[PDB]
Design a binder for this molecule. Structure first.
Ligand SMILES: [Ca+2]
Ligand SMILES: [Ca+2]
Ligand SMILES: [Ca+2]
Ligand SMILES: [Ca+2]
Ligand SMILES: [Mg+2]
Ligand SMILES: [Mg+2]
Ligand SMILES: [Mg+2]
Ligand SMILES: [Mg+2]
Ligand SMILES: [Mg+2]
Ligand SMILES: [Mg+2]
Ligand SMILES: [Mg+2]
Ligand SMILES: [Mg+2]
Lengths: 4, 435, 436, 4
């Protein structure tokens, strides 16, 4: 703000 | 048939029992949970919907990350698919979906999502395979409060391949998790910082994904499959405008197994026409993407199928990007670890079938996001044996019993080392503070 | 004539001599230094050029920030312009220009810039009125090492008006500086965090800017100027597409002074035709931009010139945004502090000239970037009296002697309080560790 | 990376  | 991905075995989840896990609740803040999946449907799972992300039990399209994470934590043991850290439908799982296909869509903040996990889900453990570069005092304070109140917070370190701090992982109240491969080598992409606390399986991690969105591979010789050894379908990328886009080759190829010998930096493939070409990987992903070199050597030789095995530098199972600038690899190609590649050497000359299949319900992923659920899953499992211990005590137990990796002592790449469920449990067996 | 901005007086720079400053070197990592400026030309200044930012001594166009910062630290005492913390041409200054008009243009990293300050500049103090939201271990380690190696690091806390951490300010090895106004009130835009350590003048700070790029205001009555009192030309903004853009009114107006009455939130301006309208500010900048209210009340009444003075809530000198949605304010308007507004009441009825003029060499700025140089300038000044004390010891002295602001004790808004040069010097005079 |  993501996925990891 | 049900497969146990290497990560599950390495962390020691398979030797313990989740029979008491019903006394624990783990909340997954991610992109949702595909409850329609056969390996996830019958879990003791609940969730709290948010106006910005639809239903927690419906990830949507191309938003399978949360489902992969969930599978690592609790894929159900049932003779099909895979198994997670707590596979026997005992652990309580709560889902908070903050990501949509397009990206973050939660109507509120991460703090609000965590609040939901604790207040609505009754979470004891909150796992977050996500993060951002920014940090704030209000957020730091909120998470510290949850942690001191007894909630164990675990998050991914990030995949930027640098020393940057990703939050929430980098707050003192949260466990920052790094990724390692099946040889326990530090994953090139795993961010290294003085916050990195513990490591978990993060390269070539097989798990559940939204139904039909996955992809798998296989190698068969003599009617037997190497699937359980770990066969990764090449993540092929080809030019798409000002960048690269996925261009997977899903097909099957059969032929006599032949190996392209590697001498220095040159290949000796000979004539691979009508054959399945076995080749050692030359170089490794990091500053570049060399997978195309060994792969192309085989293709140019006329190979019908290609099998690339790990070199001595990184013998573990790798799931690298197959950057195909000229779109030369139009045949099915896969990646296997060094041990598997050497085993295949003894089968040279035998009929071999290599295959990549799309529309699957499982897939191999790389990321600190994959390592994180191994750590939070194990944390929850170990905690179920001693629910009276506090989150801080459990966190300490995990760190104190982790298997030291890389250079001696805690380091920025792997923290205290590889999480060890058995050792952590034995630690708490003595007392909440160890022996 | 030469003006002494309020900040210089408030931090104690005007009563503590910089005669020993020659034994100190302060490095300014910013947007350059206009060495052609009369208040900066004759300083003991040097710099290290970088391939991406031209000459450190030529900021270029619309890139005056570093010059404003430098002026706060060392504008020269020469009977003209202003004066900085160390104005007598003694302190050694090293410049590292990391910003161009377009933004960050340095070919390398912040760490590289700090390395240059130390290695090439021989810096004892490194001042950074800049930052970002990101943080890294490589940075944390490098700065902690420089700090333990004896280099004092000072940086701005940021102007986002929230609790977010801006770096380098938020690293343990760096002093995070907050901004306050002339009444010592916390600036609404100053980020508040548990890293905020000390405060300095950051609202309506007059300093040097690239020659000809500045803007100033003035109020004259009976042939006498109120410039030294602090007169801020309204930072007027008018609609520009989906946002707002600067639309300053630079002109002069003369007329009898008359005051618009304020009752709570209501105005009674009467007829201001041909008059200079004096009016108390209603509301204050923060969640909104109310400057337009008192200003428009005067304009609608027919005022040819306007003077807005601070209310009791925030009596210090304010330099707020005059958001003019309907482009109503087409006359020269200015802002003055409460003391000045009250002092003007005696002049009601007298011919008053209000003027805003561009093409100046000085300008009023707001920001934690303005507070930072007061802190680093004072740190350098104080340290010059005890050069053998360590950076860590000087830092502790500054915090131990700051004048507590806001709530009792250290707080996220103002840290330990307002930096105090005289008190800090007295602490170190006893010993590098202060009183026992 | 801005000025403050
Ligand atoms: Ca299963
Ligand atoms: Ca180690
Ligand atoms: Ca001067
Ligand atoms: Ca205070
Ligand atoms: Mg942490
Ligand atoms: Mg940590
Ligand atoms: Mg280690
Ligand atoms: Mg050195
Ligand atoms: Mg700090
Ligand atoms: Mg600080
Ligand atoms: Mg010394
Ligand atoms: Mg204070």
């Amino acid at each position: 703000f993501x996925l990891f | 048939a049900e497969t146990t991905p290497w990560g599950q075995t390495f962390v020691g989840a398979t030797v313990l029992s989740d029979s008491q896990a019903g006394n624990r609740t783990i909340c997954i803040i991610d992109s949702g949970y595909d409850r329609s999946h056969n390996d996830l449907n019958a879990n003791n799972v609940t969730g709290t919907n948010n106006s910005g992300t639809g239903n927690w039990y419906q990830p949507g399209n191309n938003n399978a990350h949360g489902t992969h994470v969930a599978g690592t934590i609790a894929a159900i043991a049932n003779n099909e698919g895979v198994v997670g850290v707590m596979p026997n439908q005992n652990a309580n799982i709560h889902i908070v979906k903050v990501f949509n296909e397009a990206g973050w869509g939660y109507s509120s903040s991460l703090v609000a999502a965590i609040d939901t996990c604790v207040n609505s889900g009754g979470a004891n453990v909150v796992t977050m395979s996500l993060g951002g570069s920014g940090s704030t005092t209000t957020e730091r304070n909120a998470l510290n409060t949850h942690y001191n109140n007894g909630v164990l917070l675990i998050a991914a370190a990030g995949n930027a391949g640098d020393s940057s701090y990703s939050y929430p992982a980098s707050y003192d109240s949260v466990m920052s998790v790094a990724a390692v491969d099946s040889n326990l080598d530090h994953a090139a992409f795993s961010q290294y910082t003085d916050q990195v606390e513990i490591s978990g399986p993060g390269e070539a991690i097989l798990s559940t994904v939204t139904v039909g969105e996955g992809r798998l591979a296989d190698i068969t010789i003599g009617g037997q499959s190497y699937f359980s050894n770990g066969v990764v379908p090449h993540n092929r990328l080809t030019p798409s405008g000002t960048s690269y886009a996925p261009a997977p080759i899903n097909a099957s190829a059969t032929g006599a197994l032949a190996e392209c010998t590697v001498n220095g930096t040159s290949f000796s493939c000979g004539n691979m026409a009508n054959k399945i070409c076995l080749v050692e990987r030359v170089g490794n992903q990091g500053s570049s993407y060399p997978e195309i070199n060994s792969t192309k050597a085989c293709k140019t030789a006329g190979a019908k199928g290609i099998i690339v095995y790990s070199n001595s530098a990184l013998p573990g199972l790798q799931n690298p990007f197959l950057v195909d600038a000229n779109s030369d690899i139009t045949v099915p190609s896969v990646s296997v670890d060094r041990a598997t590649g050497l085993a295949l050497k003894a089968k040279l000359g035998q009929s071999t079938t290599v295959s990549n299949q799309g529309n699957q319900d499982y897939e191999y992923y790389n990321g600190t996001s994959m390592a994180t659920p191994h750590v939070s899953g194990v944390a929850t499992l170990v905690w179920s044996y001693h629910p009276e211990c506090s989150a801080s005590q459990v966190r300490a137990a995990l760190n104190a019993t982790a298997d030291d990796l890389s250079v001696a002592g805690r380091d920025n790449q792997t923290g205290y080392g590889m999480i060890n469920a058995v050792a952590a449990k034995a630690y708490l067996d003595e007392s909440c503070t160890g022996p």
